[PDB]
Design brief:
The structure is cut from a larger assembly and holds 1 copy of chain A, 1 copy of chain B, 1 copy of chain C, 2 copies of chain D and 1 copy of chain E.
Chain A: H1 8-26, H2 31-45, H3 49-65, H4 69-78, H5 87-103, H6 107-119, H7 127-143, H8 156-174, H9 177-193, H10 197-201, H11 203-218, H12 224-231, H13 236-241
Helix pairs in contact in A: 1-2, 1-3, 2-3, 3-4, 3-5, 4-5, 5-6, 6-7, 7-8, 8-9, 8-11
Chain C: H1 2-18, H2 24-40, H3 53-70, H4 76-91, H5 103-116, H6 120-129, H7 132-135, H8 139-153, H9 156-161, H10 172-193, E1 196-198, H11 203-206, H12 212-221, E2 230-232, H13 247-262
Antiparallel strand pairs in C: 1-2
Helix pairs in contact in C: 1-2, 1-3, 2-3, 3-4, 4-5, 5-6, 5-8, 5-10
Chain D: H1 6-9, H2 17-30, H3 35-40, H4 43-50, H5 57-71, H6 74-84, H7 95-117, H8 128-143, H9 147-156, H10 160-169, H11 173-186, H12 192-205, H13 213-223, H14 226-238, H15 242-254, H16 258-269, H17 272-280, H18 283-291
Helix pairs in contact in D: 2-5, 4-5, 5-6, 6-7, 7-8, 9-10, 10-12, 11-12, 12-13, 13-14, 13-15, 14-16, 16-17
PDB class: motor protein, hydrolase/protein binding
Keywords: Nub1, Fat10, HYDROLASE-PROTEIN BINDING complex
Entry title: Human proteasome in resting state conformation bound to TXNL1 in backward conformation
């Protein structure tokens, strides 16, 4: 902090990354927020390209750890991520911004960043990061009404982790409320421990959306009672508004 | 010597802009 | 001294508010006078360390009453002010502050209030501050989040039924604002979905009790009533207008391809 | 803690001035950590400064300056920094104080340069607060004895008055003059203002205890003032210091145009003056050059 | 006991980043011209 | 050829005071008059290091109809 060297900025970014790690295991994550913000302004004013990128990622992790999604959205709205940043630092920013956009119902921009985050992730290591981004991208893809890629569930590393989401995607695909709910009462705790339970709840509207889409795509004229039966709704009058 | 270093750097930046603009002009004419 | 005094006029507000017929005026001045006292007693402490717990416990209470007092007279800016400070005493100092009994009821009021103002983007963010367990467990939290799913999925019938099963009597206000939005929304569904509907066929659809309540709403919506009690919604003729080729937009795009093929050098 | 300052921000739209004043004193303690959301509520801070009857309207600008400074909108931050007035203590070592100081100098430097070539009628009067901090910025150089640094901003801001004062106040007057003269010819390009720098450089040179008449004439060739060069030469003989006048004479012919010398001859006519003419006319100088 | 020494260093380091960026860019273009 | 050198010498060390003549000469259809503008740029900007004058010379050097 006292020093003002230029090549130290490259070393300092690694020191900041581990300085948030010691408090990560200390489970405070709050005293470091003041230091990160103060260091970020110091790095931004000095045009510290590498330092600014790391501190922005660390701050976003800080805000997302305490579910301060409003705080992190404000930070990314004003702070400009360094274009000439590391690929490993860009990947975290794309994920953190993608997770931010996902909560703010900005699914379209979330999907672009999460897909970008996977591309810039390491090709052979950082498996845990890949699992976390894959889990969130599957939900965002389902939330957007699109379809998850079947290949990502075949990978040896992702097969065990994405299995609850694989069953979730299957339930959403059929557009059946009963099948979607069965996944919820079975993998509800896993989604909660995975930090994605809120976005799965929003998939209930999407399950209705896809199921209606096939009903219109397959039936020229379909009774409302038949629509309720096929979507496993409660009554035809509710399917009327739906 | 701080001001001399600052002004010398300032003229170096402005000279580099001149060099990069002429190098773009020559590439345009070198294709012809 | 002041802290021992601080709890003093709080019971005057607590006793008056807990009365079966509280007065909004005297409590308002009592609340208005109360907040000035808190400012000397470290109101909204920054980086709250181990200070006196009585000030933290007490300060939340007036905000809890003030937030609950705001909707009694049905004003929006007052609720936003009080709940903004109340959220500070619910998450920030929670390692010192004990879990408030009314904290879940008041937080769900904020969630239901956001749906009434159609600030759905802010609705999910504030729902994130809650732990994932009480989202599907606590009644005060389950009701607003379930209503949001009904609103987005189109279950408009269940939105009206949500009035009867509200978790608390404080919840009634924001339901009324939200119900007005639904009535305009479901009618918007009818114009684009229904080519023609019968006059009292829309009574249960619009959830209108008195048939006359259709007439004033019809002219506000400008609905053409037909001789057979049929509302004709012939408005799909305003198609996406494929009749016109966007030549200017098309020419702009194709020109840009030529730029990316020639302007590169 | 205090992970949300929205409740503190909510204390800005009340009708009681004391309530708003307290929140301003609370926003400043968290402006370094929560400037993101305060940016969305700056419009509710700037009106507090805009209102004249507000007690802490100077404090409101200071808080508004900090959030803008964190935002990156330095032009708005400096404007509200000046609005704070005495509350923006420049002696503080904080990063905000020194960054706005840097931006204040840049804005003053751009404005002074723009005003420098502008006609006196169209001279936009510089903000008094902006000048005050820069003038106080000038003084810290003199107190810290950084005369070379003080010379640079003085030339950059075209402020010859401070430029005068730093050479005289400097311990090494000849050294500063030599360094200042080198900058004036190697770095300066405005010509019209470059002459002003040399113009005041003559004022110093005439005012040393032992005047360095050699450096005056070299500067005077740039100014193209044959009358001035005649005056210094004509008083040199009256002062009997003919030894220095002869050296001035050769230096004049070596590095001055014939027109500039031909004009000088006319004022010199208007004995020892004749040997002055013989040198400047040049026929002596070539004689040594021819003989060498 | 420094004046604008920090201000000068901020100015000098600001220009250095642009100068280094432009110098690297110019060397890219000069090779293109030479080829 | 004699005039081209002569025109430049009249405006020697004139800084920007030769800008009006320089654009007139450099825009001329006569190759020699264009050559005079280059010489006029040199004499109006002797040792001034004016990158604006250098900007014009380099443009003409790489893009001009006449090799002279």
């Amino acid at each position: 902090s006292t020093q003002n060297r230029r090549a130290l900025d490259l070393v300092a970014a690694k020191c900041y990354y581990y300085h948030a790690r010691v408090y990560e295991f200390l489970d405070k994550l709050d005293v470091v927020r003041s230091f990160l913000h103060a260091r970020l302004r110091t790095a931004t004013l000095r045009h510290d390209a590498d330092g600014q990128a790391t501190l922005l990622n660390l701050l976003l992790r800080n805000y997302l750890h305490y579910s301060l999604y409003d705080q992190a959205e404000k930070l990314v709205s004003k702070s400009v991520f360094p274009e000439q940043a590391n690929n490993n630092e860009w990947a975290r920013y794309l994920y953190y911004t993608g997770r931010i956009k996902a909560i703010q119902l900005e699914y379209s921009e979330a999907r672009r960043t999460m897909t970008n985050a996977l591309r810039k992730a390491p090709q052979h290591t950082a498996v845990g990061f890949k699992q976390t981004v894959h889990k969130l991208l599957i939900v965002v893809e389902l939330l957007l009404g699109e379809i998850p890629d079947r290949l990502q569930f075949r990978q040896p590393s992702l097969k065990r982790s994405l299995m609850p989401y694989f069953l979730l995607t299957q339930a959403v695909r059929t557009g059946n409320l009963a099948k979607f709910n069965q996944v919820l009462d079975q993998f509800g705790e896993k989604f909660q421990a995975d930090g994605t339970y809120t976005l799965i709840i929003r998939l209930r509207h999407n399950v209705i959306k896809t199921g209606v889409r096939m009903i219109s795509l397959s039936y020229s004229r379909i009774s409302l009672a038949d629509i309720a039966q096929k979507l496993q709704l409660d009554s035809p009058e509710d399917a009327e508004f739906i | 010597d701080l001001y001399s270093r600052y002004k010398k750097l300032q003229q170096e930046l402005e000279f580099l802009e001149v060099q990069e603009e002429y190098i773009k002009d020559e590439q345009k004419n070198l294709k012809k | 001294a002041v802290l021992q005094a601080a709890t003093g006029m709080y019971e005057q507000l607590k006793g008056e508010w807990n009365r079966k017929s509280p007065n909004l005026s005297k409590c308002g001045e009592e609340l208005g006078r109360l907040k000035l006292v808190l400012l000397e007693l470290n109101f909204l402490p920054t980086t709250g360390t181990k200070l006196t717990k009585q000030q933290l416990i007490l300060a939340r209470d007036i905000l809890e009453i003030g937030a609950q007092w705001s909707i009694l007279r049905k004003d929006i800016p007052s609720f936003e002010r009080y709940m903004a400070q109340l959220k500070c005493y619910y998450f920030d100092y929670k390692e010192q502050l004990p879990e408030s009994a009314y904290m879940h009821q008041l937080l769900g009021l904020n969630l239901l209030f956001l749906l009434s103002q159609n600030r759905v983007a802010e609705f999910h963010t504030e729902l994130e501050r809650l732990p994932a367990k009480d989202i599907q467990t606590n009644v005060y939290i389950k009701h607003p989040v379930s209503l949001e799913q009904y609103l987005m999925e189109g279950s408009y019938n269940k939105v009206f039924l949500a009035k009867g099963n509200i978790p608390a009597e404080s919840y009634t206000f924001f339901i009324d604002i939200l119900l007005d939005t639904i009535r305009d929304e479901i009618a918007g569904c009818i114009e684009k979905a229904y080519e023609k509907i019968l006059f009292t066929e829309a009574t249960r659809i619009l959830f209108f009790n008195t048939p006359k309540k259709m007439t004033d709403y019809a002219k506000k919506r400008g609905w053409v009533l037909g001789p057979n009690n049929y509302y004709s919604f012939a408005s799909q003729q305003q198609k996406p207008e494929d009749t016109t080729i966007p030549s200017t937009e098309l020419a702009k795009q194709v020109i840009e391809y030529a730029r990316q093929l020639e302007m590169i050098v | 803690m205090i992970t949300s300052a929205a409740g503190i921000i909510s204390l800005l739209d009340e009708d009681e001035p004391q309530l708003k004043e307290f929140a301003l004193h609370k926003l400043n303690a968290v402006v370094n950590d929560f400037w993101a959301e305060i940016s969305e509520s700056v419009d509710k801070i700037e009106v507090l400064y805009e209102d004249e009857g507000f007690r802490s309207r100077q404090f409101a600008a200071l808080v508004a300056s900090k959030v803008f400074y964190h935002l990156g909108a330095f032009e708005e931050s400096l404007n509200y920094a000046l609005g704070a007035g005495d509350l923006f203590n420049v002696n503080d070592n904080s990063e905000y104080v020194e960054t706005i100081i840097a931006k204040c100098i840049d804005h003053y430097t751009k404005q002074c340069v723009e005003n420098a070539d502008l006609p006196e009628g169209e001279k936009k009067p510089i903000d008094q607060r902006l000048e005050g901090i820069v003038n106080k910025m000038f003084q810290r150089c003199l107190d810290d004895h950084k005369y070379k640094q003080a010379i640079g901003i003085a030339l950059e801001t075209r402020r010859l008055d401070v430029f005068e004062k730093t050479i005289l106040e400097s311990n090494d007057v000849p050294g500063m003059l030599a360094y200042s003269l080198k900058l004036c010819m190697s770095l300066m390009q405005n010509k019209q203002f470059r002459n002003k720098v040399l113009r005041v450089l003559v004022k110093i040179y005439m005012n040393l205890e032992k005047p360095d008449f050699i450096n005056v004439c070299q500067c005077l060739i740039f100014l193209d003032d044959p009358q001035a060069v005649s005056d210094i030469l004509e008083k040199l003989v009256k002062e009997d210091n003919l030894l220095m006048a002869y050296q001035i004479c050769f230096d004049l012919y070596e590095s001055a145009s014939q027109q500039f010398l031909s004009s000088v001859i006319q004022n010199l006519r208007t004995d020892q003056t004749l040997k002055m003419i013989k040198i400047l006319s040049g026929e002596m100088a070539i004689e040594l050059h021819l003989q060498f | 006991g420094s004046g604008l020494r920090q201000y000068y260093l901020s100015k000098i380091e600001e220009l250095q980043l642009i100068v280094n960026d432009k110098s690297q860019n110019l060397r890219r273009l000069q090779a293109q011209r030479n080829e | 050829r004699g005039l081209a050198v002569g025109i430049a010498l009249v405006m020697y060390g004139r800084m920007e005071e030769a800008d009006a003549l320089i654009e007139s000469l450099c825009r001329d259809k006569d190759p020699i008059l264009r050559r005079s503008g280059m010489y006029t740029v040199a004499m109006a900007y002797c040792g001034s290091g004016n990158n604006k004058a250098i900007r014009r010379l380099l443009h003409v050097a790489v893009s001009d109809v006449n090799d002279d």
